[PDB]
Amino acid sequence: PGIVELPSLEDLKVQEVKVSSSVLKAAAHHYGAQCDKPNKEFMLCRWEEKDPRRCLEEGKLVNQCALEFFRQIKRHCAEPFTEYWTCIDYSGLQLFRRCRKEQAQFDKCVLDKLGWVRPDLGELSKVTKVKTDRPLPENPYHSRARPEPNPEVEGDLKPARHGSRLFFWTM
Amino acid sequence: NVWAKEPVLVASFAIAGLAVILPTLSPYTKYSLMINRATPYNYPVPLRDDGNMPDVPSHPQDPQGPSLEWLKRL
Amino acid sequence: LLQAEKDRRVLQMLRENLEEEATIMKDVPGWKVGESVFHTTRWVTPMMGELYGLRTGEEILSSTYGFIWYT
Amino acid sequence: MNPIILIIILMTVMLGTIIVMISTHWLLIWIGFEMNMLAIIPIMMKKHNPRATEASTKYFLTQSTASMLLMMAIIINLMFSGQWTVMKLFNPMASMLMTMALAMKLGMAPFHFWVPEVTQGIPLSSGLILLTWQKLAPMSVLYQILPSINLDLILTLSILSITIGGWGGLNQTQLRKIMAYSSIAHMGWMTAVLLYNPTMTLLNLIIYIIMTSTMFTLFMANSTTTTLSLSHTWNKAPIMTILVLITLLSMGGLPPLSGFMPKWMIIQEMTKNDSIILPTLMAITALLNLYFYMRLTYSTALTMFPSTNNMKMKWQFPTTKRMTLLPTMTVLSTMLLPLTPILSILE
Amino acid sequence: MMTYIVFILSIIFVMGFVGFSSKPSPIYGGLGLIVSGGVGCGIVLNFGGSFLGLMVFLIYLGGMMVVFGYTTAMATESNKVVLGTFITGLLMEFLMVYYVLKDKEVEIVFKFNGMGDWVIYDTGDSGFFSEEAMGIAALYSYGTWLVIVTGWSLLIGVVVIMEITRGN
Amino acid sequence: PFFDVQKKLGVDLDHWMTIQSAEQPHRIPARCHAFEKEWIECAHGIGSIRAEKECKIEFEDFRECLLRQKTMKRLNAIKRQRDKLIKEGKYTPPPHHSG
Amino acid sequence: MSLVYMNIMMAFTVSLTGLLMYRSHLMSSLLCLEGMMLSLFILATLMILNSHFTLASMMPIILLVFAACEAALGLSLLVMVSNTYGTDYVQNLNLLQC
Amino acid sequence: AKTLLHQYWDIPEGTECHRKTYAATSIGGASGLVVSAYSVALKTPTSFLEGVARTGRYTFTAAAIGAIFGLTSCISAQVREKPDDPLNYLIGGCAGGLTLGARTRSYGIGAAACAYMGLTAALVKMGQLEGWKVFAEPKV
Amino acid sequence: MFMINVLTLIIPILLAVAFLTLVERKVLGYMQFRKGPNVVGPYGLLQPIADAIKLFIKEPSSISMFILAPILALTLALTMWIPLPMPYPLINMNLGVLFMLAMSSLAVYSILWSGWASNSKYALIGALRAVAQTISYEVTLAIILLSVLLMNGSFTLSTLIITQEQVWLIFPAWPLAMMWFISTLAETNRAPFDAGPFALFFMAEYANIIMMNIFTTTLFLGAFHNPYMPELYTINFTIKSLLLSITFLWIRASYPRFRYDQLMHLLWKNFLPLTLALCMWHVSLPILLSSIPPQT
Amino acid sequence: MNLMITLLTNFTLATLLVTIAFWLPQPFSMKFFLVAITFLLFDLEIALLLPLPWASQTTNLNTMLTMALLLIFLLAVSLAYEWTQKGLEW
């Protein structure tokens, strides 16, 4: 059987978001609106071709988008955003109803200094169009062609030939 | 009569009869269906753009497409 | 974002383990070196033994069976 | 019992067979066999003698272990190629256990010991429903899984069933064990054709069911258990004699009579293969099982036994049951030689 | 204290089935079958494993052996054959464990790769709804026919039980 | 025999239980989805015997998806050769965490 | 195949031998049928879970409720026998001879 | 089994002797195992030592039939020098039937076994020679 | 440290049981008319410690069955406070109410094994009837548990202790809760609803009692959960469980035992239609009030 | 291994307490049977019913409503059948 081919190690060094998970949930929605215009290109590549080792460059592109977004939120307002995510951090499985007043504080911060309307329910949905340079690929299910049809039935049928053609009981 | 001999039997038939008959007529079942439909478990896919169709809003803040709004609006 | 990191991590472990399959059987007869078992070059998802081999206990237990009798 | 309860239970036996005939999903087949068992138990023990208790106990143990072995075959099928399509299996082991599940189900010679035991210890109505429906429904299962059968299974079980159901029957004077031995004989004839042209097997199924319904209605003409009771049926009625004659020789299968249509066409589209030694051996043992039919005939309808007074007292009264469907099944079971081109009615 | 806990629990499972397949007194049999069902539930709850074995733990070990012990206590109430078959079944267990361990493959009529196997297994994929629990959360949307015939066979089992135990 | 009331009444009330590639209740696949879809579309309008002549490759591919027995065979051969080389004396192990 | 599947099938066939050969009581025979039910349950369940074949997850629970009512029918029959005799031996079934 | 009957029919008949006799004793061991298994399964021997005696009797009779039949097969084929006739196996089947009757220590069982075993062994070689298919086509 | 969690879980329940014995004897005295025990020890606490000591000292089947009944009863008594969310439960079981039912069934096994090993026909038929009236109420317990968590979505029970912040759940199903509480009285095998080592057997009985009290208090009511200070929630929860346990005493000391056939007749023909009708009403109704709870 | 360790500690402390408790000295009724099988069948119908709240979020609410009422109605009908047919008398 045929052997596989992968990109080597020197293709897979892209600097990654080495932040934790609690803060990454804490800044979810405004990441969903500010960036993530080109990650749906990554998602479209991933669904139309279920072959990573084909779509990874859009992964690099969304990696650098998210890194730029966290650079932008670090070097500006808010510093009590850090208090916000460490406030949601110790509340078990995370709820958005518990540490809510600091979320409104962080939202007042971002609306005054920068903008970034928090999106409504259910605006992180609502199936989306996008277009790229690449075409839709042929046979993403890698296979042969389907072999043959049936030699099928076409034409009327006559009366039966001389009867049953059993031992007797002719006609 | 019908009540004194088996009272809990009558009360059980009564609340069972309303639990059968009452799910027919209600002003709320369409709300139950829409709430139950519009909660996305899986991921709503992006697609190759269009055959120039007047739907499928591009931005997630573009108000063309279908929207859930009555959670805030009772 | 997590899907992109997961793609890069599973490709990393596949590259590591195929490099070490090339090393660990350096002189055996027969034996083509990189045999995919299948007949269609699509993307198999591997079966968490090629993602996790030769680890001796710690990461394999705390990365496969850890969740089930955790929580 | 209530007649409400029996109409419900007969409706459920029908429902189990229709679910087995109708589905495309293996769990539905297993549930059909189980529901058929569950409902068919209280048709037995309509009385309360220990005979029926022991008979239903034996039938329950053999039938339930057959059903669990069938579920084992399904689970092997999905340990291999995994889909619930009732089709070709993907393991000779799965097909092996599945054929042995049916061979315990409807009675074949390694697995047949329960059949005369359970048919003696019950009344005739329970025996009627068990033979007819319990041998109708799993033939549908075999017709659905015919492309993936090791033929040595059906060959061995079929030949051995014909010869065991033949040799048992020379000794039994009880009517019900005679009828069960005849049942195993026709199970051999209905099973050995299967991997060649199954339209033969399904027509043989319809033939056997019509014959056995005629036979049990004639033994419900009055409740008879030995042959001596049938000699007294001679003394009390003349036409039951000639119908026992014609239907017994049609169970024997002689060419002017309609019990020969199963043998004849099956030998034909059996030897348009080149199995010849197997058909001629099957037909020799088919000559063998006709003997106990013939000694029953000689006992009652042809000789005349001594009989008993109080049959004088029985002469006045009518034999005033309703026969369920007697005349239609009689002359449709016996005079149906010149309609063998109604073979191809089936598909 | 090691990796192959699935194989270990499966050894205890085979031990339990042998321990009541040697035909003891039936309440020793019920004890052994309770232990067997408990470790089978442990096995399926180790393959993730959220619901379904624990679901049946109520039924098979909560609603069956009770009735067996009940009908054993109100029916009726050491030997060399039982203990001999138990020791020989244990010996076949020991021999099959040895051929798994110090060989490569074991064949009864199959091929079994002889090593303890977490493989195959999920690759940490995002479920978020606990797949088998939502599988059991079918039968009530798509399951039209199946629960109909199932409840129908339950009702027929009811009337059958009472008729055989002397309706009316 | 077998009837087709399932077909004539039209409501496929049992053809949802049957295979994958259907309405799984929240739309997820199984582990071996695409193998089943390929083998079914191989042998769809085929008379079940030239299917056995010309769908053997994808059916073996499907069985190797479901069982992964050959992949385990190769994996076990790798591990036992690893054991004999680490017993014999080549590379007191660096192949994890220290490349 | 795997390692666990061989041991579950070995447990099944030992349970089947315990079902078939059985010495004195019938309660132990029906109890071994219950053990065989458990074996088929566990086998089908681990198959469906390892496949992540989420769709037909009906199999194990419906298999067990049905083979449960099979065992209910069996217990009714066994208690009927033990009523109409003294015990539930394989003896007292010696009548109705072949 | 398929393996030992295939060993028996592998050797040309023909003179490659006494392998035929050993294969026929394997036939006897298999037949004796079958008959002895069903017989001790359907008797309750009471007790087990007598069951061992019954099994030993059946296996010894079947193995003796196989041994004597293989010896007379090989010897008759060497003497008459015609490896195609069925009459040598007719003589062989009659000889096996007579020795079956003598180990059962009778006369009529031996003579009828001579006749039927001879005619059936003639049918066996006659069908293997002209060519009659084993147990199936299964085609049409 | 996790072993310290284990020991603080399963050791102080024994002191809880012993002090429950003194509390139920004292309060049933003050119900009846009795001071006491107040002589041995100050206000009667050394008296139950000496009760357990003296019962350990004394010098009293099939040692298999004779030991495997109380070992199973008391390991049930130990294992059965695993997922009860005293705010942080010891194991966050994603489904635990079905575990409650299963371990009630294992207690049925324990009583049947001790009755079989008792080996005397009067004790055998007594233990048989006690098994039947222990098993006759796990139907009702299961179906009421089903209907009360259908209002709250998931088996997790931590979502339940979330959802009872707004109202105490005793209000939106009061007759259903009342019938569950009567079935807890039946399952605990006390009045009105009715050989060794009796220390172990007795111990497992009372631990099952306090389990049902705590599970009642968690399943139906509670307090508002303070962020980062669960001590106040634990206090108000414990006081509610204790007031319900005193209420359980209060029902104990005032009613005769039922006749057994009256007990069965009452269960089937009086609970069983009423539970079914209330449960189908809790099936059909949250789909009618635009309110199906979020399984997460 | 958390709950396995807890389970094992419960078993070991219970065995310790049993060994301290031990070492320091050193015809029938048919009506009994119908209770068990009645429990068994209604417990099976319980086993069908109780995964309902996992299911209670579908898009075909009418079908779930109808088959759920079918299940409880059949349970009450089986109760009604044994009720009319004096199935638990004493």
Q: Print the SS3 string covering chain I.
A: CHHHHHHHHHCHHHHHHHHHHHHHHHHHHHHHCCCCCCCCCCCCCHHHHHHHHHHHHCCCCCHHHHHHHHHHHHHHHHHCCCCCCCCCCCCCCCCCHHHHHHHHHHHHHHHHHHHHHHCCHHHHHHHHHHHHHHHCCHHHHHHHHHHHHHCCCCCCCHHHHHHCCCCCCCCCCHHHHHHHHHHHHHHCCCCCCCCCCHHHHHHHHHHHHHHHHHHHHHHHCCCCCCCCCCHHHHHHHHHHHHHHHHHHHHHHCCCCCCCHHHHHHHHHHHHHHHHHHHHHHHHHCCCCCCCCCCCC
Q: Report the alpha-carbon distance of residue F4 to residue I148 in Å, rounded.
A: 44
Q: Is the Cβ pair A148, F37 closer than 8 Å? A: no
Task: Please give, one letter per residue, the 3-state secondary structure of chain H.
Answer: CHHHHHHHHHCCCCCCCCHHHHHHHHHHHHHHHHHHHHHHHCCCCCCHHHHHHHHHHHHHHHHHHHHHHHHHHHHHHHHHCCCCCCHHHHHHHHHHHHHHHHHCCCCHHHHHHHHHHHHHHHHHHHHHHHCCCCCCCCCC
Q: Tell me the chain J residues in contact with residue C69 when contact means C-beta distances shorter than 8 Å.
A: 1-4
Q: Report the alpha-carbon distance of residue B23 to residue J66 in Å, rounded.
A: 10
Q: Is the Cβ pair E164, G58 closer than 8 Å? A: no
Min Cα distance C24 → chain J (Å) is 34
Does any CB of chain E come closer than 8 Å to the CB of residue F56? no
Q: Report the alpha-carbon distance of residue I122 to residue I115 in Å, rounded.
A: 10
Task: Please give, one letter per residue, the 3-state secondary structure of chain D.
Answer: CCHHHHHHHHHHHHHHHHHHHHCCCHHHHHHHHHHHHHHHCCCCCCCCCHHHHHHHHHHHHHHHHHHHHHHHHHHHHHHCCCCCCCCCCCCHHHHHHHHHHHHHHCCCCCCCCHHHHHHHCCCHHHHHHHHHHHHHHHHHHHHHCHHHCCHHHHHHHHHHHHHHHHHCCCCCCCHHHHHHHHHHHHHHHHHCCCCCCHHHHHHHHHHHHHHHHHHHHHHCCCCCCCCHHHHHHHHHCCHHHHHHHHHHHHHHCCCCCCCCHHHHHHHHCCCCCCCCHHHHHHHHHHHHHHHHHHHHHHHHHHCCCCCCCCHHHHCCCCCCCCCCCCHHHHHHHCCCCCCHHHHHHCC
Q: Is F68 left (phi over 0), alpha (psi -120 to 50) or beta?
A: left
Q: Report the alpha-carbon distance of residue D225 to residue D228 in Å, rounded.
A: 8
Does any CB of chain I come closer than 8 Å to the CB of residue C67? no
If one counts every other C-beta atom within 10 angstroms of the C-beta of residue I257, the result is: 12
Q: Are I293 and I286 in contact (CB under 8 A)?
A: yes
Q: Which of E52, E70, E131, E136 to mutate to test the interface with I (most CBs of I within 10 A)?
A: E70
Q: Are H51 and H28 in contact (CB under 8 A)?
A: no
Min Cα distance B28 → chain A (Å) is 21
Residues in contact with A153: Cβ distance below 8 Å, sequence separation at least 6, in sequence order:
none
Q: Are D242 and D318 in contact (CB under 8 A)?
A: no
Does any CB of chain J come closer than 8 Å to the CB of residue I15? no
Does any CB of chain E come closer than 8 Å to the CB of residue G15? yes
Q: Which of I63, I67, I68, I101 to mutate to test the interface with E (most CBs of E within 10 A)?
A: I101
Q: Report the alpha-carbon distance of residue H96 to residue H114 in Å, rounded.
A: 7
Taking an 8 Å Cβ-Cβ cutoff, which residues of chain A contact chain C?
1-4, 6-9, 12, 14, 16-17, 24, 39, 42, 46, 50-53, 55-56, 59, 62-63, 66, 141-143
Closest chain J residue to the Cα of I121, Cα to Cα: J27
Q: Report the alpha-carbon distance of residue D145 to residue D91 in Å, rounded.
A: 12
Q: Report the alpha-carbon distance of residue I141 to residue I275 in Å, rounded.
A: 10
If one counts every other C-beta atom within 10 angstroms of the C-beta of residue G91, the result is: 9
Q: Report the alpha-carbon distance of residue D94 to residue D78 in Å, rounded.
A: 10
Nearest by Cα to I150 from I219, I90, I102: I219
* Domains recognised in chain E with CATH numbers: 2-165 (1.20.120.1200)
Q: How many CB pairs under 8 A join A and F?
A: 19
Q: Is C57 left (phi over 0), alpha (psi -120 to 50) or beta?
A: left
Q: Tell me the chain I residues in contact with residue E70 when contact means C-beta distances shorter than 8 Å.
A: 112, 128, 131-132
Q: Is the Cβ pair E127, F25 closer than 8 Å? A: no
Pairing state between β A128-130 and B46-48: parallel
Can you read off the two tokens belonging to residue H135?
A: 């147990």
Q: Is the Cβ pair F18, D80 closer than 8 Å? A: no
C/H touch flag: 3 or more CB pairs below 8 Å: no
Q: Is the Cβ pair G72, J41 closer than 8 Å? A: yes
Min Cα distance E119 → chain C (Å) is 6
Residue ranges of I 220-239 with Cβ closer than 8 A to chain A: 227-228
If one counts every other C-beta atom within 10 angstroms of the C-beta of residue I266, the result is: 16
Q: Is the Cβ pair G58, F17 closer than 8 Å? A: yes
Q: Is the Cβ pair J81, E159 closer than 8 Å? A: yes
Angle value at C-alpha D22, between D19 and D25, nearest 5 degrees: 85
Q: Are E163 and D1 in contact (CB under 8 A)?
A: yes
Q: How many CB pairs under 8 A join E and J?
A: 100
Chain-centre distance for alpha carbon D211: 10
Closest chain F residue to the Cα of B40, Cα to Cα: F26
What's the burial of F76, exposed, middle or buried (CB within 10 Å: 0-12/13-18/19+)? middle
If one counts every other C-beta atom within 10 angstroms of the C-beta of residue E94, the result is: 11
Closest chain A residue to the Cα of I162, Cα to Cα: A95
* C-alpha torsion angle, residues A109, A110, A111, A116 (rounded to 10): -170
Q: Domain extents for chain G?
A: 1-86
Q: Report the alpha-carbon distance of residue I114 to residue I67 in Å, rounded.
A: 9
Q: Tell me the chain F residues in contact with residue E119 when contact means C-beta distances shorter than 8 Å.
A: 68, 72, 75
Q: Domain extents for chain D?
A: 1-347
Residues in contact with F63: Cβ distance below 8 Å, sequence separation at least 6, in sequence order:
D80, D81
Q: Tell me the chain D residues in contact with residue H139 when contact means C-beta distances shorter than 8 Å.
A: 273
Cα–Cα distance list, F41 to A144, D187, F44, F54 (Å) = 11, 39, 5, 12
Q: Are H115 and H97 in contact (CB under 8 A)?
A: yes
What technique was this entry resolved by?
A: cryo-EM
Nearest by Cα to G37 from G10, G60, G3, G5: G60
Q: Tell me the chain J residues in contact with residue E133 when contact means C-beta distances shorter than 8 Å.
A: 51, 54
Chain-centre distance for alpha carbon H4: 12
Min Cα distance J2 → chain C (Å) is 7
Q: Is the Cβ pair H137, D274 closer than 8 Å? A: yes
Q: Resolution, rounded to a tenth of an Å?
A: 4.2
Min Cα distance B43 → chain A (Å) is 8
DSSP F16: S
Q: Is the Cβ pair E163, D1 closer than 8 Å? A: yes
CATH code for G1-86? 1.10.287.3510
If one counts every other C-beta atom within 10 angstroms of the C-beta of residue I261, the result is: 12
E/A touch flag: 3 or more CB pairs below 8 Å: no
Q: Maximum distance among all alpha carbons in chain G?
A: 52
Can you read off the two tokens belonging to residue I277?
A: 């009708």
Radius of gyration of chain J (CA): 23
Q: Report the alpha-carbon distance of residue H68 to residue H4 in Å, rounded.
A: 17
Of G65, G75, G83, nearest to J44 by CB-CB distance is G65
Domain harbouring J65, CATH code: 1.20.58.1610
Radius of gyration of chain C (CA): 15
Task: Please give, one letter per residue, the 3-state secondary structure of chain C.
Answer: CHHHHHHHHHHHHHHHHHHHHHHHCCCCCCCCCCECCCCCCCCCCCCCCCCCCCCCCHHHHHHHCCCCCCC
Is J45 inside any structural domain?
Answer: yes
How many alpha carbons lie under 13 Å from residue J76 in its C-beta half-sphere?
Answer: 22
Q: Report the alpha-carbon distance of residue E155 to residue J78 in Å, rounded.
A: 6
Q: Is the Cβ pair I146, J75 closer than 8 Å? A: no
Nearest by Cα to A18 from C1, H38, D252, H106: C1
If one counts every other C-beta atom within 10 angstroms of the C-beta of residue A79, the result is: 10
Residues in contact with G59: Cβ distance below 8 Å, sequence separation at least 6, in sequence order:
D27, G44, G45, G48
Can you say whether the dihedral through the CA atoms of F22, F24, F28, F33 is positive or negative? negative
Q: Report the alpha-carbon distance of residue D181 to residue D104 in Å, rounded.
A: 15
Q: Tell me the chain E residues in contact with residue C48 when contact means C-beta distances shorter than 8 Å.
A: 118-123
Does any CB of chain D come closer than 8 Å to the CB of residue H42? no
Q: Report the alpha-carbon distance of residue I147 to residue E66 in Å, rounded.
A: 25
If one counts every other C-beta atom within 10 angstroms of the C-beta of residue F5, the result is: 11
Of E119, E135, E137, nearest to F72 by CB-CB distance is E119
Can you read off the two tokens belonging to residue B53?
A: 């169709």
Q: Is the Cβ pair E113, F73 closer than 8 Å? A: yes
Q: Tell me the chain E residues in contact with residue G64 when contact means C-beta distances shorter than 8 Å.
A: 56, 59-60
Nearest by Cα to F58 from F29, F36, F33, F30: F36
Which chains share 3+ C-beta pairs under 8 angstroms with D? A, E, F, G, H
Q: Tell me the chain I residues in contact with residue E66 when contact means C-beta distances shorter than 8 Å.
A: 105, 108-109, 112, 131, 135
Phi, psi for residue A129 in degrees, rounded to 5: -95, 150
What's the burial of D160, exposed, middle or buried (CB within 10 Å: 0-12/13-18/19+)? middle
Nearest by Cα to I217 from I171, I256, I161, I263: I161
Nearest by Cα to H121 from H64, H79, H70: H70
How many alpha carbons lie under 13 Å from residue H84 in its C-beta half-sphere?
Answer: 2
Residues in contact with E137: Cβ distance below 8 Å, sequence separation at least 6, in sequence order:
F25, J51, J54, J55
What's the distance, Cα to Cα, between the start and end of chain J in Å? 50
E29-55 burial, b if ≥16 CB within 10 A, otherwise e? bbbbbbbbbbbbbbbbbbbbbbbbbbb
DSSP A2: P
Q: How many CB pairs under 8 A join B and F?
A: 4
Whether the bond between D318 and the residue before it is cis, its omega within 30 degrees of 0, is no
Min Cα distance I134 → chain E (Å) is 11
Closest chain B residue to the Cα of J80, Cα to Cα: B9
Amino acid at site I102: A
Residues in contact with D21: Cβ distance below 8 Å, sequence separation at least 6, in sequence order:
D137, D140, F1, F2, F3
* C-alpha torsion angle, residues I240, I244, I250, I256 (rounded to 10): 180
Can you read off the two tokens belonging to residue G76?
A: 């009714």
Q: Is the Cβ pair E149, D35 closer than 8 Å? A: yes
Which 3 state secondary structure label does DSSP give G81? helix
DSSP-assigned beta bridge partners for residue B46: A128
